[PDB]
Write a protein that holds these residues in place. Structure first.
Motif, PDB file in Angstrom:
ATOM      1  N   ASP A  12       0.829  -1.195   0.000  1.00  0.00           N
ATOM      2  CA  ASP A  12       0.000   0.000   0.000  1.00  0.00           C
ATOM      3  C   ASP A  12       0.870   1.254   0.000  1.00  0.00           C
ATOM      4  OD1 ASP A  12       1.002  -0.454   2.486  1.00  0.00           O
ATOM      5  OD2 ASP A  12      -0.896  -0.214   3.563  1.00  0.00           O
ATOM      6  N   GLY A  13       0.213   2.415   0.072  1.00  0.00           N
ATOM      7  CA  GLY A  13       0.944   3.671   0.093  1.00  0.00           C
ATOM      8  C   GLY A  13       1.847   3.813   1.300  1.00  0.00           C
ATOM      9  N   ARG A  14       1.425   3.274   2.446  1.00  0.00           N
ATOM     10  CA  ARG A  14       2.275   3.271   3.631  1.00  0.00           C
ATOM     11  C   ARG A  14       3.529   2.428   3.432  1.00  0.00           C
ATOM     12  NH1 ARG A  14       2.765   5.804   8.027  1.00  0.00           N
ATOM     13  NH2 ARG A  14       1.324   7.192   6.914  1.00  0.00           N
ATOM     14  N   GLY A  15       3.517   1.507   2.474  1.00  0.00           N
ATOM     15  CA  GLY A  15       4.683   0.715   2.151  1.00  0.00           C
ATOM     16  C   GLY A  15       4.768  -0.644   2.808  1.00  0.00           C
ATOM     17  N   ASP A  16       3.674  -1.149   3.371  1.00  0.00           N
ATOM     18  CA  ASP A  16       3.676  -2.430   4.062  1.00  0.00           C
ATOM     19  C   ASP A  16       3.024  -3.503   3.201  1.00  0.00           C
ATOM     20  OD1 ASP A  16       4.610  -0.720   5.952  1.00  0.00           O
ATOM     21  OD2 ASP A  16       3.083  -1.155   7.468  1.00  0.00           O
ATOM     22  N   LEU A  17       3.485  -4.740   3.370  1.00  0.00           N
ATOM     23  CA  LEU A  17       2.883  -5.870   2.679  1.00  0.00           C
ATOM     24  C   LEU A  17       1.535  -6.208   3.300  1.00  0.00           C
ATOM     25  CD1 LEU A  17       6.118  -7.991   2.919  1.00  0.00           C
ATOM     26  CD2 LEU A  17       5.489  -6.566   0.972  1.00  0.00           C
ATOM     27  N   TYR A  18       0.545  -6.459   2.449  1.00  0.00           N
ATOM     28  CA  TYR A  18      -0.778  -6.823   2.933  1.00  0.00           C
ATOM     29  C   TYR A  18      -1.495  -7.616   1.855  1.00  0.00           C
ATOM     30  CZ  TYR A  18      -3.068  -3.311  -0.002  1.00  0.00           C
ATOM     31  OH  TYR A  18      -3.532  -2.578  -1.068  1.00  0.00           O
TER      32      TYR A  18
END
Length: 37
Positions: A12-18
């Motif tokens: 995502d934009g925050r940069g975390d895998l999901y």
RNA sequence: ACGAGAACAUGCGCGACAUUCCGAAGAACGCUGAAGCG
């Protein structure tokens, strides 16, 4: 030897895998079919 | 040497006062970044 083509994970934009909800929803719809709102 | 001769249908006066074009209303419903494997 060496690698060739790399497929990137979704982040995502925050940069975390999901794992997206829509991908889980699609899988559960394929299993569960036979409007899923 | 005309029922005639003069003699302004005129004067002062605002189409004006009170008014919300508002009231109610999800841009959302469904939708696997995946299939084949050369």
């Amino acid at each position: 030897k060496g690698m060739n083509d790399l497929h990137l994970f979704v982040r995502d934009g925050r940069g975390d895998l999901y794992i997206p909800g829509s991908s889980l929803k699609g899988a559960l719809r394929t299993v569960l079919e036979g409007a899923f709102h």
